[PDB]
From a paper:
Myo7 is a crucial component of the tripartite complex that maintains the necessary mechanical tension across the cadherin links. The Myo7 tail domain consists of two MyTH4-FERM (MF; myosin tail homology 4; band 4.1, ezrin, radixin, moesin) domains separated by an SH3 domain. Harmonin plays a pivotal role due to its ability to interact with cadherin as well as all other components of the complex. The results presented here reveal nearly identical interactions between members of the Myo7/harmonin-a/SANS:ANKS4B tripartite complexes that link cadherins to the actin-rich core in stereocilia and microvilli. Both Myo7a and Myo7b MF2 domains bind to harmonin-a PDZ3c with similar affinities via a novel mode.
The basis of the harmonin-a PDZ3c/Myo7b MF2 interaction was determined by solving the crystal structures of Myo7b MF2 and of PDZ3c/Myo7b MF2 complex at 2.44 and 1.88 Å resolution, respectively. The MF2 domain adopts a canonical MyTH4-FERM supramodule, with limited flexibility between the MyTH4 and FERM domains; while the FERM domain consists of three globular subdomains or ‘lobes’, similar to previously described MF structures. Limited structural changes are found in the Myo7b MF2 supramodule upon PDZ3c binding, with an overall r.m.s.d. of 0.63 Å for 414 Cα atoms between the bound and free structures. This limited conformational pliability upon cargo binding indicates that the groove of a particular FERM domain defines its cargo recognition. The five linkers in the FERM lobes dictate the orientation of each lobe and thus define the shape and, as a result, the specificity of the central groove. The distinct orientation of the FERM lobes in Myo7b MF1 and MF2 domains readily explains their specific recognition of different targets within their FERM core elements (reviewed in27).
Numbering used by the authors: 1 to 10, 1605 to 1625, 1627 to 1875, 1881 to 2068, 2075 to 2099
Amino acid sequence: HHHHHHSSGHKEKLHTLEEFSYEFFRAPEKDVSMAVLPLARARGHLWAYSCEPLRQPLLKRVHANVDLWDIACQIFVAILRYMGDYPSRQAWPTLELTDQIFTLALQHPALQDEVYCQILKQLTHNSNRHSEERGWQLLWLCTGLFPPSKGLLPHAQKFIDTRRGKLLAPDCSRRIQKVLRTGPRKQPPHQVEVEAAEQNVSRICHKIYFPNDTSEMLEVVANTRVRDVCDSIATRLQLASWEGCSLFIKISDKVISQKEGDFFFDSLREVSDWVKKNKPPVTLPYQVYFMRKLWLNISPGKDVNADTILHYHQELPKYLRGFHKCSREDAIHLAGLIYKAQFNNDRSQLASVPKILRELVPENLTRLMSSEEWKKSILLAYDKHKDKTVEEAKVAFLKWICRWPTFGSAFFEVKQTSEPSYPDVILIAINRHGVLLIHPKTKDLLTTYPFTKISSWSSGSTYFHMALSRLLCETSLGYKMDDLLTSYVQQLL
């Protein structure tokens, strides 16, 4: 009957775990005594608020396993510390408390009811308004991670239903409904989740960055999946489709892609834990980016919004690094389009702005003409776009380069030791055609390894290898290559 909303018309007695305890809680410790030993006071109910730490698990099923006793007791202390009912001279960071409360319960589903019972116990006959407020914050965190069992659920629902007047109570009840639909979380609450709980705020917005130097605030809940955020981003930006687009975490010297069917807050913690371990207590700053990952079946003009927000600002810095094989004539034609996309009608910035040529011409082709020469040729190419919009210019830029073999690729400047036929330092490109090998001086295609022909690939922190002929690369970017190759290979319908 959790699928039901119950009513009587009036306020019912506040529901406790007293009746539940009689069957599922273990025997309460009643009272050999010595007059020298201290009294050891506060002999209240086991199912009601106690400022005294536990010594045995509350539940029979957790008490029946001696290995679970230590975890149960450590959970209760972190519960006490969190709620401000413990002598805490040592001010523990709230995340160390919340990790200690929920981490092992995600691992051992026996502890899941134990966590619920300990929070509900602490919310029963609690005369402290600070502690009660904090207790509701933990229950709120809990309902977003795992639900109570079949036997516990009716009691937990009635506990919330008889206290509907509590600020976070309607949300706790709604959250139990959601975690039953979408399943439990893999990670304990995140920094963001915990900071919103602490402020008694039940709505979270996370900032997402776009390649066009913009950002949006996206609404996220405990059960939000990485794909759900993309669906929201695609509605926001008005993209026809986000197929081939993914979210990325820019953290440390890494740009790590997020798995679509992973919970957003699970994905955040998993990546940070990976990064934290691969670097040798303070939290790691990060940015969340939405970008195109796989450039398969991209047709400029079909989705103008994706073209002007994503594709242009993604292709632009690659072209400027001079990764493509292009002429002085292509550079003049494209620099006029790049000028129009950025300055629109302001014609004077080409003379005014110093080092502007860096923003308009590939770094390799810069030496072909003098400063005044590029300026003269670019103005003439630009004047041809007076009746175009900034958006038209961005789509024209793309239409002209979209058929290029190196268009929509990820570039890696590795050190190869495999074939002495090729130069020492080489440029690798992963795109729709496969793994492309390019000469850095003359941008000629050395070889193309299609996906159908690749057998295996491995990467460490110091390298990347491939097999068919065997390719050896010395790079720190191995993780991104490994990931992009696996992702491209995995595209099968």
